[PDB]
């Protein structure tokens, strides 16, 4: 739609304004239910034929279930906690005995009911098959009768819609152990997850926008297994909620800006550590310096808030003028001259320094840019591919106004070679005490002497 | 010591829907299966329903389903039926008993009569 | 009420063999391995007494046997006994998930 950003040339970064945020804050839990029969031996004479692939399915199944049985770059500054918290608690309310039963007994038409727990937790029950009906009207009257032979083999391939979903189920709780994300199909398909969506308490307007993006929520939600007694095996998933929806959200890129020395390796420089996304929910910001936990999906963010910085409204005063006296504006400096570009949503920033060839080209004119140096960037409508250094790029090509702000070198506003360059953690202030403190020394140095 | 004792019964008027209790001591209940059955004098054994191990599959007889409904419960032990619409041929005397082994519901495993009680006789009358 | 056709009554001399019998449909007693047959006094609670066809329970003598044939159960009994004046019937499950039960057949002594 509106998709901008105004990248800065006082300090060589893009910050894509103009997004929705739609942050998840809190966790739903749900269980979902299988029912399913302890079905004895399969009490045939002979082999017959026709019964063949009825008698190996059954047997998939006993194994499944019995299988199942025997089953039971401010990344620094981010911190670590339990993602899986509220379903593994509702799992343990589960373990209780005689907490199931309420369930199995509560949900014994209805597809979807509401049960409390020991614990006030009341949070939905709902019921994925009903292999009850099945197998004790379809399948068993017919394969326990004498010298057994079923009607016909189709009466088999619906049992297979009745089944091979659960078979899906055991290799993919087999192999994550528990713990899967994404959320398959089987566990929970299209249709049903729209109706799940249709069930917990939230807004309509979330609603609509967990239906609009049924595959990210997918993406996103986890599972775990609950216990397994009595036989009617359970899941708890843990699809997330969603606390605000639909406020500006910027990905800030960085760029590296550093002057061309002719003499190589004395070349000091600063560049901003500030990469990733900043939301403004409420009265501040939430930053998430991971690009990988946070998804885009047309103009659509989606990102978790524990791994979060609820950092204050001042982020754009120091995003718009660097020195001002109300942010520490954390930046890396160090004497390395590394060509190096970033792709933002709506162009390209290269940073190319020293001897390295620079193009932008396109598939229409050849070639139609060249960086000689300086940090440069270029529109997503201006060009097509970039070539820096030995390696090759590709600009997003989704419709969008982006414009390039004149900034300056911040790098000449300094000293020509005073700052360190074996620090990691760094603002202005640090540095310019840093600055201060080295400049103390060098004319203490001067007087004494 | 396995017992099956009865409760309830006796002479009730037309209409007048009635729950029927079991009781039970000496074995593990929840561990196998109870049922009931009926007999009136004059005739022979007429079938009417069962459960399995908690509340699940209430199974009942053709000719006598929608008439009744049966639930069971864990702490006392005690099935109870529960039966409406009362006619003149339900004045029988009526069995709750036992049967099942293992954690099944299917009910051709759930067959087997191991144990009986003594039933209640109830007559309809004006 | 669809039931199990049975005799009225047998009368038999002590020491002396029966061969009583009950007919259904093939969604009935025919096959399955469903057989059961059951004796009960007057006044007193019914008994296993024949499961699973031929099986016998616990504490239960070896006259009886019980057997099947197309759609017809048979009770068959050794050496008869002035205790076994009862009456006797057949069970099984039926197709359409219930277990149908026999009219039941008097048996008598003389």
């Known amino acids: 739609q509106n998709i901008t950003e105004e990248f800065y040339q006082s300090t060589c970064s893009a910050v894509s304004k103009g997004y929705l945020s739609a942050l998840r804050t809190g966790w739903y839990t749900s269980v979902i239910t299988i029912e399913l029969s302890n079905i004895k031996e399969n009490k045939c004479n002979g082999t017959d034929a026709k019964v063949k692939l009825i008698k190996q399915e059954l047997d998939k199944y006993k194994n499944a279930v019995t299988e199942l049985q025997l089953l039971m770059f401010l990344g620094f500054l981010l911190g670590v906690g339990s993602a899986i918290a509220s379903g593994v608690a509702v799992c343990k309310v589960l373990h209780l005995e005689g907490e199931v039963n309420k369930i199995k007994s509560a949900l014994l038409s209805t597809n979807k009911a509401v049960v409390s727990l020991s614990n006030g937790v009341s949070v939905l029950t709902f019921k994925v098959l009903d292999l009850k009906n099945y197998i004790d009207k379809q399948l068993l009257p017919i394969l326990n009768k004498q010298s057994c032979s079923i009607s016909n083999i189709e009466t088999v391939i619906e049992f297979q819609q009745k089944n091979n979903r659960l078979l899906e189920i055991t290799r993919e709780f087999s192999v994550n152990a528990g713990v899967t994300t994404p959320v398959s199909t089987y566990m929970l398909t299209n249709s049903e997850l729209l109706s799940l969506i249709n069930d917990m308490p939230i807004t309509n307007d979330q609603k609509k926008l967990m239906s609009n993006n049924v595959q990210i929520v997918r993406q996103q939600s986890y599972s775990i297994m609950c216990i397994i007694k009595e036989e009617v095996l359970a899941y708890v998933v843990q699809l997330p909620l969603y606390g605000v929806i639909d406020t500006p959200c910027w990905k800030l890129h960085t760029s590296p800006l550093c002057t061309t020395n002719t003499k190589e390796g004395s070349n000091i420089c600063l560049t901003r550590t500030d990469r990733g996304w900043y939301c403004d929910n409420a009265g501040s910001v939430s930053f998430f310096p991971q690009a990988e936990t946070c998804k885009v999906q047309s103009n659509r963010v989606f990102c978790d808030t524990m791994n979060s910085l609820t950092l204050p409204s001042e982020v754009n005063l120091c995003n718009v003028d660097i020195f001002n006296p109300k942010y520490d504006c954390k930046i890396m400096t160090s004497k390395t001259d590394v060509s190096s570009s970033v792709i933002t949503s709506l162009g390209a920033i290269v940073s190319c320094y020293g001897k390295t060839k620079c193009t932008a080209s396109n598939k229409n004119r050849g070639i139609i840019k060249t960086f000689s140096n300086g940090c440069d960037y270029v529109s997503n409508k201006g060009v097509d591919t970039v070539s820096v250094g030995n390696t090759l790029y590709y600009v997003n090509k989704q419709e969008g106004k982006s414009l390039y702000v004149k900034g300056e070198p911040i790098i000449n506003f300094y000293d020509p070679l005073v700052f360190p360059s074996d620090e990691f953690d760094a603002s202005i202030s640090q540095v310019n005490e840093k600055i201060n403190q080295s400049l103390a020394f060098i004319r203490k140095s001067d007087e004494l002497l | 010591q396995v017992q099956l004792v009865e409760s309830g019964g006796g002479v009730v008027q037309p209409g007048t829907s009635l729950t029927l209790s079991c009781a039970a001591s000496g074995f593990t209940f929840r561990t196998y299966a109870f049922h009931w059955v009926r007999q009136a004098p004059g005739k022979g054994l007429e079938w009417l329903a069962l459960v399995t191990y908690d509340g699940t599959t209430q199974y009942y007889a053709d000719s006598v389903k929608g008439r009744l409904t049966i639930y069971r419960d864990n702490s006392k032990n005690t099935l109870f039926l529960h039966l409406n619409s009362l006619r003149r041929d339900d004045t029988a005397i009526y069995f709750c008993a036992r049967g099942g082994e293992g954690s099944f519901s299917w009910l051709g495993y759930l067959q087997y009569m191991d144990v009986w009680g003594q039933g209640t006789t109830v007559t309809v009358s004006s | 009420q669809s039931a199990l056709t049975q005799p009225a009554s047998v009368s038999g001399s002590p020491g002396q063999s029966i061969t009583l019998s009950c007919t259904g449909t093939?969604?009935?007693?025919?096959?399955?391995?469903?057989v059961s047959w059951y004796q009960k006094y007057p006044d007193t609670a019914p008994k296993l007494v024949i499961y699973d066809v031929s099986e016998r329970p616990s504490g239960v003598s070896t006259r009886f046997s019980g057997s099947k044939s197309g759609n017809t159960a048979s009770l068959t009994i050794s050496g008869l006994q002035p205790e076994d004046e009862a009456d006797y019937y057949c069970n099984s499950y039926s197709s359409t998930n219930t277990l149908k039960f026999g009219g039941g057949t008097k048996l008598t002594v003389l």
């Open positions: 093939s969604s009935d007693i025919g096959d399955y391995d469903y």
